[PDB]
Each structure stands twice: as structure tokens, then as C-alpha cells.
Scaffold this active site. Sequence first.
Site, short mmCIF file in Angstrom:
data_model
loop_
_atom_site.label_atom_id
_atom_site.label_comp_id
_atom_site.label_asym_id
_atom_site.label_seq_id
_atom_site.Cartn_x
_atom_site.Cartn_y
_atom_site.Cartn_z
N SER A 1 28.37 3.80 0.27
CA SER A 1 28.67 4.71 -0.87
C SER A 1 27.61 4.52 -1.97
CB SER A 1 30.08 4.42 -1.32
OG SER A 1 30.70 5.54 -1.91
N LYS B 1 23.46 3.93 -1.63
CA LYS B 1 22.34 4.44 -2.48
C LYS B 1 21.51 3.24 -2.97
CE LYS B 1 25.82 7.53 -4.49
NZ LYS B 1 25.90 8.75 -3.67
N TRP C 1 31.96 15.73 0.84
CA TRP C 1 31.41 15.48 -0.52
C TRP C 1 29.98 14.95 -0.42
CZ3 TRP C 1 32.44 16.94 -5.25
CH2 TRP C 1 32.00 16.20 -6.35
N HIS D 1 35.45 8.52 4.61
CA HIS D 1 34.44 7.82 3.77
C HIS D 1 34.84 6.35 3.73
CE1 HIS D 1 31.43 7.45 0.58
NE2 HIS D 1 32.35 6.85 -0.19
#
Lengths: 390, 388
Positions: free
Chosen positions: B227, B231, B318, B369
Site C-alpha cells: 500500500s 509506494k 482504487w 487490498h
Amino acid sequence: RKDYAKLANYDESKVPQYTLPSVLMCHDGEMVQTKEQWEQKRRPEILNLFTTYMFGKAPVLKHKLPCTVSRINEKALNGRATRKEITIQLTDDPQGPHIDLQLYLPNHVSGKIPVFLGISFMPNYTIYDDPDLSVSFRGSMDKSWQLDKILEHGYGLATFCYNDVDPDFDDDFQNGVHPYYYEKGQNFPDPDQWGSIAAWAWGMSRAMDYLETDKKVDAKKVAVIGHSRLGKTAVWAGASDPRFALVISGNSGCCGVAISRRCFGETVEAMNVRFPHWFCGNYKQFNDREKYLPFDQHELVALIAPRPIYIASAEEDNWSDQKGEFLGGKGAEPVYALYGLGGIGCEEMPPVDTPYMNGPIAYHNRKGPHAVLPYDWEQFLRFADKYFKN
Amino acid sequence: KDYAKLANYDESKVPQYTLPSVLMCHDGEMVQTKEQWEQKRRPEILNLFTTYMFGKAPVLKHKLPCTVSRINEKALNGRATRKEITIQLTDDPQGPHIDLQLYLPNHVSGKIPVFLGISFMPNYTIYDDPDLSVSFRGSMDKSWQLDKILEHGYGLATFCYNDVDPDFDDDFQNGVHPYYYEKGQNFPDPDQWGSIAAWAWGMSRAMDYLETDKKVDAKKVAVIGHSRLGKTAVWAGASDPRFALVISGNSGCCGVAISRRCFGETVEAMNVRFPHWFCGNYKQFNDREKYLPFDQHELVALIAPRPIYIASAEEDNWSDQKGEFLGGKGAEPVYALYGLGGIGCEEMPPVDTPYMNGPIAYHNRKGPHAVLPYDWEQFLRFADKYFK
Ligand SMILES: O=C(O)[C@H]1O[C@@H](O)[C@H](O)[C@@H](O)[C@H]1O
């Protein structure tokens, strides 16, 4: 596609609390209490912040651009004036964009002649109802240039249309001068490179390059002037080019001389959303993040010091934030003091039609609409006389 | 402003876009050799991500004090050694520090490859290890699969990201940021680190220990994050080439997903809901993905020729699963400079269909997710190809 005009605060009692960034405090903490620290350390820091984060870097040339005097009339207004038309080639392309500069100088005046360098929304025929020109309509903008008054004081007026440099419409910079200065692997300005206002300002510097070579013009006595988005431009032309003797901000307002942190009338987001082409990319980071600005517009006015500036407001132009225009001047006062120059001459914002011009920063807020009117010119020339005459 | 209601999830409605050319230098030179890439194009691209997206982190002239504050060679009933390294992030020892927790498999021949993970929660959540105490011990176990890592002859280093900078907008008044200001500075400059840049710099301070460790293969440290920490894991990998492999767990928007697709999460949604994540400068690209001087396929290109696994999840609309795949796809021209293949398919693979026979791995797995056991199965199959 929001209308920001309805959403805007115009209530003085709902302005948020804010601290101005200290003009005098360098990034490393060192305070300025000498013009020498200002000129040597602090002014360069601030100039760099405004170039990187707001206006963007314009091309720097190794030589003056090619220009021609394509028409001269030594008896232009029943002999009251010499009119010249100068074509300034902005690029290596002779069929590319040109400034069409129109210069009026008064006849029967002996010295070198102080000049107003103005930038206009419309072509040069709109400046004066001049019967040796063709075709808005001829002299439709006379109210806003008052050439008769300028000639009466023994000054000249040079203007060009800003469209000459960059059309004022969001075409992602495929037109005007921008593309002519891209690198081979660049289809768009970098985030720290010039938008439109910087291009127009650079425009005025290319006009000044011609002017200082004109035998009749006093290169040491050139005033820059513009209204609204061209007010913004004129103040940047003055900040970024110290050859200008005097700077006139005609309701420059938001991202002009108005303090952003007041979030009164026009805001940075209103500005960047409606006019994405005006400022550099970097500046869009400050949309509704005024508190995170590394500067405010009092520091822009501070880049004119010690040189004089006239900030004009209009009573009905709440969008432009007339008090914030006043406070942007107030905020520059500390830097003018380094030069032993006074302030505006009043602590709080003065009532309508009450000019203060006895200091190096003049201010008025006149009755009526967002415009340049004869009233405004009346004060501008009174103020110019103090510097351009004895 | 709600951003859930503005999200496009309709593939037919994705706007036209041009990816900025990864092999075209700013001055026009086309890269067709790995030499031009390494000497010119990569430095340009790294500078753009540093300046305009993540923000410049401090560069240190020498390492910071690390200290092994507890070992246990017989951890997990003899199966592994557990070490507890403190890592100063400053000159000041009372300043912020990383509580690095490292597990190494007992009785393996040679120096051990390590997954450097960064965790949402404290280290006691990674495993039910009785030698620890107290978001309860073992909670995150499902997302770390220590048993499976150990079974592979690999270990695992983890610190909680809260050690380096808290995950909330405090105007950088807490965490490491204040300890690197200059007199007359309350706040990072627009071109300087936010929290992802700091968390990534965190994993660089953790590697600064890991290399000094004699049982660790310092040429075989992977970086992994889920998540927001996915990044972070990519940026770590891009801005620190010592890392050997990069694992992107659902990194999504401003990870590997193509920003210009405006699918699910957008740049504006991100910067507005998480103002502290990226540098000031990045906030200028809100609603302006057309004008990024890069996209996320160039971030992936900064890993090359080192391998990277991009994991998507089917329910995670998303994150933009197709744009994640296409962040990989778009890197392949740089890996090709090093005579390496691509992902191995043209279209986005169906669900639960991993491709991992090139230097870029992709899978879109079933469910939410998260990092699930399935993901680790594939991460370890991938690692095996480079680490055995
Ligand atoms: O799951 C989470 O909390 C976060 O995941 C990230 O990948 C995403 O960018 C955030 O908007 C939020 O969704």
C-alpha cells in the site's frame, strides 16, 4: 468548472489569522539590517523564490534581439508628437512572433525624454484616436492611456499588445514564444519555467532593450505600467528588471501586490484554475495552501526598493482585495527603510479618493470600477514628476 | 470534498494519454544503449522524481550509530536467530531511532538473503514469538509469512514506519524532519522530503546496518511494502540501488500505476487526503496528470536492470490494477537496453495468472487490498530465480 466569484470571502471580519514570512530574515536565519546584506544575500534569495515558485524563468539572451523602426512620423498629432513603430523579433524565426511597439514622444522638448512603457490588452490603434492609423476601434482605450496628459508633462508613452508575445488563452504553450525556446526533447515548460505573465514581462524587457538605444528616450527614466493581469506583469517586469525607474500597479490584486494569506476575493486556486497558463507549474502547488507559500506579495513589492512604485486600487474591485493591495505595500516598508526612505505615510488603509504619494510607495483607492481612469493617470504623473523632474 | 464519488472504474472511459518517453533525454538525445541510460537519462529521471514527487532527503557523509540491543540464536525453538538493532536517525542518541527486528534462518550454508520490509504496526505483530510482549503479538503474521521465508533459506528485517515519521499531517513538527532543518526553517522546502521520502530513507538506514551483518548477503536484500509502504518500497529501490529486488504490494496511485489513467485514486485524491506523503512540489500536479514531466513507468525504470514484482488484487479497483501492470509494461524498453525480456504478455493477464520469467513480474490475485499467503508464494518463487 466552478464560479469562484460566489464562493469568495469579501467579509473583513472573516479573514483568517496569518503571519507574513519575514522579508528581512534570510533562509539560514540571518536578519538584514543593512542595504548591503539586502543587495548581497536576501534580495537574490527572494528573487530566486519568485522566479522558481511563481513566475518562472524566462530565456536569458546573449545579445539584444533584432528590431526595426518600420515607420516614423515626426509630425504625428498635428506636430505635437513623433510616433515610431518598432518591430522586435522575439525568436530566431523572422515569420515568428514580433512585438509591434508604438512609441509616442512629445515634440518641442530638448532633453532625453522619460517614457511610460505600458502593455495593452488590445492593439496599438486603441491607445489614441490617431487619424494616421486604421482598423475594438481607434482610441477606444484612450481613457486608460491618457496620452494627452503624458505629452502635457513632457513624457512619452511606448505600448505593445501582450498577445504579440503570448496569446492569453490556455493552449498548453504550443503558440506564442514558449515553443521557440523549448529543448528538442521538451513539448512543454518545465515546472520552474515561464508561464504567460513572465513571457509578457520578458516582452517589456525586450521593449526596454530597444528604448535604451533610442537617442530621444531617457533610459534612466522609464516607468513600467499595466492594469489587472498586466498590472501583475508590470510589477514583475519591475522586480525582475531593475533598469525600470518606476513601477505602476493598476489593480494588480491577487498574485500582484495583494497579500495571498488574507484569502480575500480572488485566491491562488481561483487564479491557477481559471488561468493555468499565467504562472509556472510550481505555483499550482499553492492552490488553497496560502499558508505554505515560501513568500507573500509584500516581498515582491520589496524587490522594487529603492525604486518608487504606485499601487492603485478601485473601491468596487473587492475581487482584487484593496486592503491586501495596501498591506503588500505596507509589508515592503522595512526594506525601503534600509535605504533611509519613508513608508506610504499612513498606518491603516486610507478612505476613497485619498492619495498618499509623498513616500517611495504611493497608494490610492479611487471611486468606481476595476479600470485605469484619468483620475489614476492624474496621480501617476504627479508621482512621476517627483522623480523624472526637479 | 469526497473523492470516492469522483473515481472512474470504467475501462472504456479512461482518457487518451501519451506516456512521456523514458528513452528521450530533455535535450532530445534518444537512448539506445545502457551507457547513455546510466550516464545521462537515469540521472535526469531520478532528479525529476526527487525534485517534483518524493522530495530530497538528507545525504550523509558517514553512517549513523546502530547498536544490537538483544540477540537470540535459538529463537522460534532453534529454527532462527532473532536480532534487535537500534538505529539512530540523527547525531542525538535520544533523537528518533528505528527498532529494526531481524530473523535469520539457523543452519543454512553461506550468507543469507533478507527481505527488508517496512510495517504499519510494531515488530511484535510480525510473528507470535513468545520472547516478545505487548495490534497484538502475531496480528500481521498473515501478511509476513515468516515460516515460508525461513523455509526458503531467507530471513526478514522489519521496522514500523512510525519510528521514522508518524503517518498524519502535523506540518512535520514530529519525527525526523525537524532534526534536519536549517536555522530560519519551520517546514521542508517544496523540493524536500515528505513522509514517503523519509520512510524510504528509513529503509536506507536499515540497509546501512544489514550490510555490516556477517550472516547477511548484502548483494541479496529485497525491499517489500504494502500500500503506502509499497509506494515507499519502490522509491527506496529506485533511490538506493544497493537493494537487489523490489516488491510492490498494491502500491497503486503514485506507486507503479500510470497516473495519466485517472482510474480509481488520482494525484489530487492522494495529496489532498495525505498532504504529508509527497513533497510540496507534487501538489502542483493535482488534476494535472497530463503535465507530469514523468509517469510511474519511469519510476519502475529506475529499478532496471534489478528485478521487481508488481502484485495487484482483483477487488482493489482504487489502486488501478491495469495501470499497475502498465507501469511495468512501460519499463520494458530500459530492461531491453540490458538484453532482458519484458513481463511476457501484451494484454493484462487474467486473475491468479502470475508472469515472473522476465525481470518484471506481475500478478493480479483474487480478494482484497492486502498481502496474502498466495502473494508470498509468488514473491519467493521470484526471489529463488535471483537468490539461489
Ligand atoms: O489502504 C489504505 O489505507 C491506503 O492505500 C494506499 O495504497 C492508497 O494510496 C490510500 O488512499 C489508501 O487507500
